[PDB]
Amino acid sequence: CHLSDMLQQLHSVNASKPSERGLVRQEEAEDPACIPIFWVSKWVDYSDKYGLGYQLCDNSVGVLFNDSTRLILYNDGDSLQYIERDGTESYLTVSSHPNSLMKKITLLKYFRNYMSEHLLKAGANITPRLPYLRTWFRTRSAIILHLSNGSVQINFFQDHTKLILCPLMAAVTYIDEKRDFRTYRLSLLEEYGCCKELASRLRYARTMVDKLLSSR
Amino acid sequence: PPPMSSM
């Protein structure tokens, strides 16, 4: 769990008051070598009945089911990863699958088909540099998605802005209102500052990471 | 609340 590292990285950037000091030189904090490998491109909240389905940017699809199990279909459309409630990981294929997983596979295929047909692909214009969804929650303002590689993604509903936080790179990717996809080193935002918009979202992010840490 | 991401 790299959540503690993430919280520390956010504590540090926020404490530097990046938008409240001198000349903001945000462009100097950009680091394309830190562009994430994975993020959530689409999601469907069917948690009142089945669970939460998501598409990663590589076109792989996962579901976190209401029974606390996870099923992930690789982008080849056949290879499967199943994670039981106790945490046991199994690797198989749809072509071979146990009869006991037929229902969950079918559900996943419906999720997959819907996302492929109906939703915008977040970061669609970007070539990325397999994690599963550890957990998620929603607020009035955002959906928060925690990936098993330590990444935390926050999608804001009102303005469609998004953060992808990676504690391994100590980086943040910001997708703005114009769908501009920019990756920054957090330490460099400390060094060079950032706009009020990103600064406010990083403050929000800290609160969300606290929530993740307090509900582990 | 929106039950899915942006269309």
Residue numbers in the entry:
A (entry chain A): 372 to 500, 508 to 594
B (entry chain E): 101 to 107
Q: What does the original paper state about this entry?
A:
We examined the crystal-packing interactions formed by the polo-box domain (PBD) of polo-like kinase 1 (Plk1), a validated anti-cancer target, whose phosphorylation-dependent protein–protein interactions are crucial for successful progression of the cell through mitosis. We have observed an unreported binding site in a number of crystal structures of the PBD, which is formed by the rearrangement of surface residues involved in crystal packing. This site is located close to the phosphopeptide-binding groove, making it potentially accessible for phosphorylated proteins binding to the PBD. The new binding site consists of seven residues: Val415, Leu478, and Phe482 form the bottom of the pocket whilst Tyr417, Tyr421, Tyr481, and Tyr485 form the sides of the pocket.
Interaction between TCERG1 and PBD has not been characterized in detail before. Pro103TCERG1 in TCERG1 occupies the place of Leu75PBIP1 in PBIP1 and imposes a conformational restraint that prevents the FMP motif from turning into the hydrophobic pocket, which is occupied by polyethylene glycol used in the crystallization buffer.
